[PDB]
Amino acid sequence: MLGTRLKAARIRAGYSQKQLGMLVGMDEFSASARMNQYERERHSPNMRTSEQLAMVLQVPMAYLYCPEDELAELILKVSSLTPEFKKELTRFIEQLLAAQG
Amino acid sequence: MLGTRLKAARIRAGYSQKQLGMLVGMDEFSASARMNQYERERHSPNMRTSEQLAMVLQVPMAYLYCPEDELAELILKVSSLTPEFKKELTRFIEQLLAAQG
């Protein structure tokens, strides 16, 4: 998991390294430590843990695995769209892919 | 890594389990085997390997880690957009996020 994305997702949610750490079942005393290893990428969270982080952070798992800065930003935006707006988006994108390019 | 996404990305690119397997430096005799384990999720490709798969498959790493079917489909579409169209997209999305919802 990309540390930057994990850190960026923790800041947006307003969680301290310890808070996020405990929100996923970590031991208090080492919570903030375990998290730092992840955000430093010194440690890699397995799929199970990744799903927990995404749910808590309220961000798509894909975001935490999106190295492309532009795309990631888009992945968070499209996700924050309401069902009604999400429909308008796809409609517009399809139209463009149809002009094609 | 989500198997379905890995398999779906291999089919779209037109690669056989062995081809994809070797395209990332695997031993011929076990290439197709190693890949099946990944697509079955019986084996998890580390970040390094994930980057190799994404590059070869020509799909954003995020896609291979996008459990939400709707989003994934969108992640592939937006990625297939030309720089000129990619600008139009963001412009439209921003406008919507501004109506806000």
Residue numbers in the entry:
A (entry chain A), B (entry chain A): 1 to 101
What text appears in the publication on this structure?
Cumulatively, these results indicate that BswR positively regulates the transcriptional expression of the small RNA rsmZ by specifically binding to the promoter region of rsmZ. Further structural analyses suggest BswR functions as a homodimer, which uses positively charged helix to fit the major groove of the dsDNA for binding.
The crystal structure of BswR was determined and refined to 2.3 Å resolution. Consistent with the prediction, our structure reveals that the N-terminus of BswR comprises α2-turn-α3, a typical helix-turn-helix (HTH) motif for DNA-binding (in which α2 is for stabilization and α3 for recognition). Based on the gel filtration profile during protein purification, we found that BswR exists as a dimer in solution. On dimerization, an average interface area of 1438.7 Å2 was buried, accounting for 20.8% of the solvent-exposed surface area (6923.4 Å2) of each monomer. Furthermore, dimerization was mainly mediated through hydrophobic interaction, which involves the residues Leu71, Leu74, Leu81, Phe85, Leu89, Thr90, Ile93, Leu97 and Ala99. In the dimeric structure, BswR exhibits an uncommon large area of dimer interface, which is formed by the extension of C-terminal helical region (helices 5–7, residues 61–101).
